[PDB]
Amino acid sequence: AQNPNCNIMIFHPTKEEFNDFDKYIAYMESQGAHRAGLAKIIPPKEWKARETYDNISEILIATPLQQVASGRAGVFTQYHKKKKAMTVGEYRHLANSKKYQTPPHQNFEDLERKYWKNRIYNSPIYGADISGSLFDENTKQWNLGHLGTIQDLLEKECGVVIEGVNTPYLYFGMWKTTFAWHTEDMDLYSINYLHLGEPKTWYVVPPEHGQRLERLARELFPGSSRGCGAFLRHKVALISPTVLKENGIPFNRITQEAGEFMVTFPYGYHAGFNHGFNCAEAINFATPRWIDYGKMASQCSCGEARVTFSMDAFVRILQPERYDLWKRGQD
């Protein structure tokens, strides 16, 4: 068995290897990358996502989200308070203000210590989930707006044509902006490209050990667990590395820098935080190996998780027993 310790693997494809996305995902899996739940892909030196980032300031963040925490420093939830619209240029200036900027630090490890110590005492503002792309249309390799769609994959694997579309999303971050512990919708893959700015630190639990994280989460968030049988679908709970280590939960960590891709694998729980002003782009995708994970994915039916239009068909076809109750949650 390749990568039996479930370490995060880092890949350096050549420009030739960067041509065929599906093939390269399958290669990484042949080497055991999926066992970690997360992999890093450093693009060939010849590749670029676009020529420059000099003209992005007029992108609108229609609903910036202030991420307000409740709890203790290593075990907290966050809720999102909607703020007034602002441009990327306005948001960048806000991120660099004295109130929100990254503090002085020695190295990524020191910054990580400061994040876990101090996150809860601040409410950073995240520009998340903005439909769009920063890849140039002429970028032919690993262009996250030109991937094969999940609907086409389901149709190729299973023979059933379904409605829905699959487009990318932009994320504009600042110091302390936080992504809570989650797997993807329908336990899909994700791919995330850090276009510019400061790093993003990731934490991940191997897919084979996901249920250990879920059990800890039920213990640590006992009211939320009674409210919903899949409350991590709400994407609000944070648990620190120290708390995970105290409770014996297997996990790994890695920092993504600008110009790097990260891939999350089916049922790989992940969480993390941004180091400072940055912009990332991410999208879900599927491969043949996903189908079995899609069929078994948990679902929120309490009504809180509320997701995209395209998830309907995935539930309806892969999880027909659950369909009824899940759709009651969505309506």
Q: Which residues are annotated as a binding site?
A: 126, 182, 184, 192, 200, 228, 234-235, 270, 300, 302
Q: Which residues are annotated as a binding site for 2-oxoglutarate?
A: 126, 192, 200, 235
58 binds, among Zn ion, Mg ion, ligand OGA, none (CB under 5 to 8 A by kind): Mg ion
**Distance separating alpha carbons of residues 43 and 263, to the nearest angstrom:** 13
130 lies in the site for Zn ion, by CB under 5 A: no
CB nearer to ligand OGA: give 115 or 171.
Answer: 171
Interface of this chain with Ni ion, residues 154 to 213, rule: CB under 5 A:
190
Out of 58, 104, 107, 320, name the contact with Mg ion by CB under 5 A: 58
Question: In the complex, what is the shortest distance from the CB of residue 329 to Zn ion, in angstroms, rounded to a whole number?
Answer: 7
| Angle, CA of 209, 243 and 226, to the nearest 5° | 70
CB nearer to Ni ion: give 112 or 185.
Answer: 185
Question: In the complex, what is the shortest distance from the CB of residue 261 to ligand OGA, in angstroms, rounded to a whole number?
Answer: 10
Question: In the complex, what is the shortest distance from the CB of residue 144 to ligand OGA, in angstroms, rounded to a whole number?
Answer: 10
What element of type H or E holds 253? strand 252-256
Which amino acid does the sequence have at 186?
Answer: M
**Distance separating alpha carbons of residues 263 and 275, to the nearest angstrom:** 19
Q: Using alpha carbons only, how large is the chain's radius of gyration in Å?
A: 19
Residue 185, token pair as written in the block: 């919708």
From 101-109, 278-286, 302-310, 311-319, give the range in contact with Zn ion by CB under 5 A: 302-310
Question: In the complex, what is the shortest distance from the CB of residue 249 to Mg ion, in angstroms, rounded to a whole number?
Answer: 42
Classify each residue of 121-137 as buried b or exposed e, where b means 16 or more C-beta atoms within 10 Å of its C-beta: eebbbbbbebeebbbee
Using the Cα atoms of residue 208, residue 211, residue 214 and residue 220 in order, give the sign of their dihedral.
negative
179 lies in the site for ligand OGA, by CB under 6 A: yes
Out of 143, 192, 224, 240, name the contact with ligand OGA by CB under 6 A: 192
Helix (H, G, I), strand (E, B) or coil at 108: helix
Question: In the complex, what is the shortest distance from the CB of residue 264 to ligand OGA, in angstroms, rounded to a whole number?
Answer: 5
Residues 5 and 36: beta-carbon distance below 8 Å: no
Q: Which residues bind Mg ion (CB under 5 A)?
A: 56, 58-59
